[PDB]
Amino acid sequence: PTINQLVRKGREKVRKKSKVPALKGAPFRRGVCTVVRTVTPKKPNSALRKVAKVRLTSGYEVTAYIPGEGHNLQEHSVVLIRGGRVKDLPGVRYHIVRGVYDAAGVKDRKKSRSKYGTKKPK
């Protein structure tokens, strides 16, 4: 573009589209599980992965992932979530924070237990 065109029209600042819409500014957000079930992932994977349809404090409902091996989550379980998606499960754009509210830590876990909300063992 000519310098003149730049004086006229200018350069256009790119904008950032948050990948974590439901969070409404905040770092984490509180909620309750309405549905708790398993969803099979997209190619080229096969599994029964753990999810929860969760109702937000912002009166939103998001599909959220349940990390670890096994969980104590059920319908009506109050839960805390955080950002970051799960590539293989579409629509699941957030993660459940284990070891908060009715989300238990992972029983018997010995490695990286901060991520899976397990207290230090014997």
């Binding site: 909620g31 309750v32 309405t34 109702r55 937000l56 404090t57 009166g59 009506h76 109050v78």
Partner: peptide
């Protein structure tokens, strides 16, 4: 937001 019965409404 109302759930089958929970004192949690959302």
């Amino acid at each position: 937001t109302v759930x089958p019965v929970x004192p949690y409404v959302x």
